[PDB]
Design a protein around this ligand. Structure first.
Ligand SMILES: C[As](C)(=O)[O-]
Ligand SMILES: C[As](C)(=O)[O-]
Ligand SMILES: [Ca+2]
Ligand SMILES: [Cl-]
Length: 328
């Protein structure tokens, strides 16, 4: 074995419950005043109806299952009631040892980000920016657990939120700007000792329901991001021959799966016991509360995140690359 354990960094595609559990614990600490993310009918705090690809990945590589990790959280939560009066809670959570540092909402780059809402009629003034961008996760893992020793496979899957908050937030990043942030982060991993890196591009989200009417902007972003990331990783691989870099082309996998459903009616993998027959609709609608009968016939769980079947598909592809030594 070249590695005996896996470390994960990224966003809702990878998170096994950080976003969920930090909003549960902040809601308890504020006595009901924080909205819970990834609530039922999402599965056990994942942004899906089952395990996500980082969980299947560890099974397919026969390594230990991911365990959630994060750093110490310490914030002054300042809320405002109806009448404009401020109320405050000092929120703390100790650092949580683990291996999967991903968090829903995270963008490539450093720093914390804001993507938690007040609840129960309160508005939030400050103190909810407790979640960590992908590069911040890396920084915190090194602070908490030291440098990498070479016995880890490190997965890095980020960039979707750099697009998301460009569309629906306050950002204006180009794809190749966002890619540069990912390349900086991945260079931090190498400078910190990582010797095996599984780096993913952004999936082909052309048909994601939440991106309807954003297609020109999404398409240009994703194509520019993924071309920049690939070229940048080729360059890092040439400069660091002691590092195995695996390029998980999530884009092409989503594209291939979707073109098989569009042209042939189905994408089937009998080794995995999966058949997808829908790549354009939500299995779960956040308007009716509708969850269709057989959600694992769909690529999309909600308007963006994949079903657990599509997560399994992703994991098999990524594992395949590692098993076959298919490096840059
Ligand atoms: C800052 As305090 C209310 O936990 O002493
Ligand atoms: C910023 As998002 C789709 O993780 O809510
Ligand atoms: Ca998201
Ligand atoms: Cl770790």
């Amino acid at each position: 074995a070249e590695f005996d354990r896996i470390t994960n960094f990224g966003d809702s595609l990878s998170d096994i419950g950080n976003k969920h559990m930090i909003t549960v614990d902040m809601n308890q600490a504020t006595s009901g005043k924080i909205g819970i993310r990834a609530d039922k009918p999402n599965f056990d705090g994942r942004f899906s109806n089952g395990p996500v690809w980082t969980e299947y990945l560890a099974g397919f590589l026969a390594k230990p299952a991911p365990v959630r990790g994060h750093g110490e959280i310490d914030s002054q939560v300042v809320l405002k009631d109806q009448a404009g009066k401020q109320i405050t809670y000092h929120y703390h959570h100790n650092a949580l040892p683990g291996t999967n540092w991903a968090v829903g909402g995270a963008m490539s780059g450093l720093g914390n980000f804001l993507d938690i809402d007040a609840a129960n009629g309160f508005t939030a003034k400050s103190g909810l920016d407790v979640l960590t961008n992908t590069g911040q996760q890396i920084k915190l893992r090194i602070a908490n657990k030291g440098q990498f020793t070479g016995n880890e496979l490190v997965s890095y899957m980020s960039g979707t939120n750099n697009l998301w908050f460009t569309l629906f937030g306050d950002l204006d990043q180009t794809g190749n700007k966002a890619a540069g942030f990912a390349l900086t982060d991945i260079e931090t991993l190498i400078d910190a000792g990582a010797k095996q890196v599984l780096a993913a591009n952004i999936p082909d989200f052309v048909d994601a329901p939440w991106f309807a009417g954003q297609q020109k902007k999404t398409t240009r972003f994703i194509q520019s991001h993924n071309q920049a990331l690939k070229a940048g990783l080729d360059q890092l691989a040439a400069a660091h021959p002691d590092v195995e870099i695996y390029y998980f082309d999530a884009f092409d996998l989503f594209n291939k799966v979707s073109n098989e459903v569009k042209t042939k009616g189905k994408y089937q993998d009998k080794e995995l016991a999966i058949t997808l027959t829908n790549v354009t609709g939500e299995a779960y609608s956040y308007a009716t509360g509708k969850v269709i009968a057989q959600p694992n016939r769909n690529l999309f769980w909600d308007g963006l995140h994949p079903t657990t079947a599509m997560h399994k598909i992703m994991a098999k592809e990524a594992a395949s690359l590692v098993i076959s030594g298919r490096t840059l």
